[model samples]
Target: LATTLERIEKNFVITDPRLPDNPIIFASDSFLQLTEYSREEILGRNCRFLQGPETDRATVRKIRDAIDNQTEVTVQLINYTKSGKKFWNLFHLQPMRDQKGDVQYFIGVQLDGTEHVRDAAEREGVMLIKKTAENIDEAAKELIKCVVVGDGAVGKTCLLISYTTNAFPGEYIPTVFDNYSANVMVDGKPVNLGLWDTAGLEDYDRLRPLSYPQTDVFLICFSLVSPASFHHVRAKWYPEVRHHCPNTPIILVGTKLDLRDDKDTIEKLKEKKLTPITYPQGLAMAKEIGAVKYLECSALTQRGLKTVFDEAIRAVLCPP
Candidate 1:
């Protein structure tokens, strides 16, 4: 009881979705503020920092032993804050392995009055258990999340929504805060393609970092309708995507090439130093990404939607 009191105050929150369990860290803001210690001083120091006469006994025994054993364990415990305030923290403690499969450090945590710790690899296990119990079929395999950032009002979302929905409203509904998604079945398998259509100037900052994870492909969707879109992608999104998701396949897209103004759109694409693709770039892109095959199509007219999906499907399903 005494030891548990001390352990609960030294708490941490695991925010990394990738490492749902066995996540580490303990020195919390409240612990620091009460102790008058700098954040840097408390970080990476584990729960021992909260030790005092009032610490709970049961929690200390199991937690310390689990840390020593390098195993994931959970224990209901109490801990004391620096000012000696007694509190409860049902801890979930777990160990995570490094790239080489060696447990480098132990993760100790007290979350929301419940035992909650788990190994990072246990993410799949927990998810599997929950999903199996719920009878959910998760079809997201080899997902490719992409964010199209360039000049606002330039049809980034339009391109994606058009390709995914295959229908264009005569006018446009602009995207706010840069977010959207498209789940496509490629080559007889399901693949999720996430898209964020953000204002080039406003949405670019918050949008770039989010694209770093699980990005298999990127389409720099500019427009024959606006050259600034092309220029901004060249200046901003391309460099950022290259720096972050360098291996992500990039396709320069010239959108809104309706037959009403098709000749001008095609000619402008021909004029650009970088060639843009309305369609027929699928094979090259699939090859670049090591896909089994590729195809092309127009989303709005449904002209090339089938071919595009066929290629996309073949690429993800039968990747060489």
Candidate 2:
């Protein structure tokens, strides 16, 4: 019967509670395949042989507690194979009961979780490529210059700061003029994205246009909760970019999205007999200005942040 159990394809092992150390009495063929262990080396051995230096002590304690109480437990933990290759194991352990209701043996089942870990590593690689353009030769890379423009206190600076740093700024420090650059992959092609931020106050109205020349795309931003800022998107920002770069693509963005639905913000707007801008209104303005796309995002919550840049790149490269 033990040899017949070994022929089964399930990744499972059974340990006898009657044994002194609770050693493994039966190991399925799939279990030996998963751990790269021969049946000879696996029999009469404790399962601790699969754990390595990096295994979490707390998780082990949980498993130990479950075994002592004769209860079933499930956990995700890192386990090592015979050759020291580490893989994530989704482990499920259950205590088998005899006819008398006493614990007879323990069955442990394992599921491989390495594919999800590999996917995360691939995503991290893409982020690293986006931040560091120096790794690739400049001669072979294409540069896309994107400029951000909008009214004062419209969250334009916050949008750029959060997207680049992946963290929201603690306080508002108004921008004079700043620039950021990243190496991003668009459609599997390497493109260097240069972000130009301009001051929105009238004080630098003369100095702001200097950064608009040779622009590939423009992100005209407005606060969703501020009607005055939304008004300027069509009145001021659209005409300004059109006058400077007549052929550049424009992407209209609604900022501070979180405030549009907040209770306090709604009450404050009500006191003044005002209301937040809606999505349809934004789309109407985008059509009026011939913007390539209309997007809404919150720097504080990071919703729709990555899509903003990705669409900006697509507007320039894929061109409508």
Clashes of each: 23, 0
Off by over 4 Å in 1: 1-129, 133-141, 169-173, 177-183, 190-192, 259-299, 305-320
Question: How much lDDT does candidate 1 score?
Answer: 0.47
Pairs that collide in candidate 2 are none
Q: How do the residues 1-320 of candidate 2 rate in per-residue lDDT, one tens digit apiece?
A: 01123223456766655544666655666778889997546655688899998788899999999988888776768899999989877677777655477665677777665733346764554344322222211221244668899988889878877886776776877876665545566777655566767788878888778666556899999999999999998889999999989999999999999999999999999998999999999999999999999999999999998889999999988985
lDDT of each: 0.47, 0.76
lDDT of 2 at 206: 87
Each prediction's RMSD to truth: 14.2, 23.0
Give the Cα RMSD of candidate 2: 23.0
In model 1, the number of clashes is: 23
Instruction: Encode model 1's per-residue lDDT on 8-98: one tens digit a residue.
Output: 3333422112222322122344445554555434432344555566657766887767766777676555556666765555556555444
Q: Estimate each model's TM-score.
A: 0.44, 0.56
